[PDB]
Amino acid sequence: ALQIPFAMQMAYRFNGIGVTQNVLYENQKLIANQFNSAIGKIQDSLSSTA
Amino acid sequence: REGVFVSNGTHWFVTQRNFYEPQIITTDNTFVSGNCDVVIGIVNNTVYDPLQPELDS
Numbered sequence: 664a665l666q667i668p669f670a671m672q673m674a675y676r677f678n679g680i681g682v683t684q685n686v687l688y689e690n691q692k693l694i695a696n697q698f699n700s701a702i703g704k705i706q707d708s709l710s711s712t713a
Numbered sequence: 714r715e716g717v718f719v720s721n722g723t724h725w726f727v728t729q730r731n732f733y734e735p736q737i738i739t740t741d742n743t744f745v746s747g748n749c750d751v752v753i754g755i756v757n758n759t760v761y762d763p764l765q766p767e768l769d770s
């Protein structure tokens with residue numbers, strides 16, 4: 664394993680879907696809020712939906 | 714463009730991701746995307762532009 668900053672890992676993941684990594688760095692706070700929110704939807708989804 | 718920025722402690726370089734290969738950073742190695750202020754963790758530097766020394770002739 665090689666350490667790498669997580670915002671620098673997602674800039675590699677965006678290149679792997681053909682999106683230029685400035686689309687991540689220009690939107691990092693927004694992308695973080697969408698991921699954090701989406702995990703919040705998983706807590707509620709699993710907490711209710713047996 | 715491809716690879717990642719790094720510093721040896723005093724100089725800044727771009728290397729390919731899977732093998733250390735320090736290239737001095739240029740307008741060939743990089744693409745622009747607006748002004749600094751949106752980017753978390755950006756750092757100041759000089760990027761070399763190979764045209765400007767050639768047209769000094």
Ligand SMILES: *[C@@H]1O[C@H](CO)[C@@H](O)[C@H](O)[C@H]1NC(C)=O
Binds near residue numbers: 721723724
């Ligand atoms: C960093 O790299 C440059 C070019 O190889 C060299 O001049 C300098 O001595 C290096 N500094 C350190 C701290 O390794």
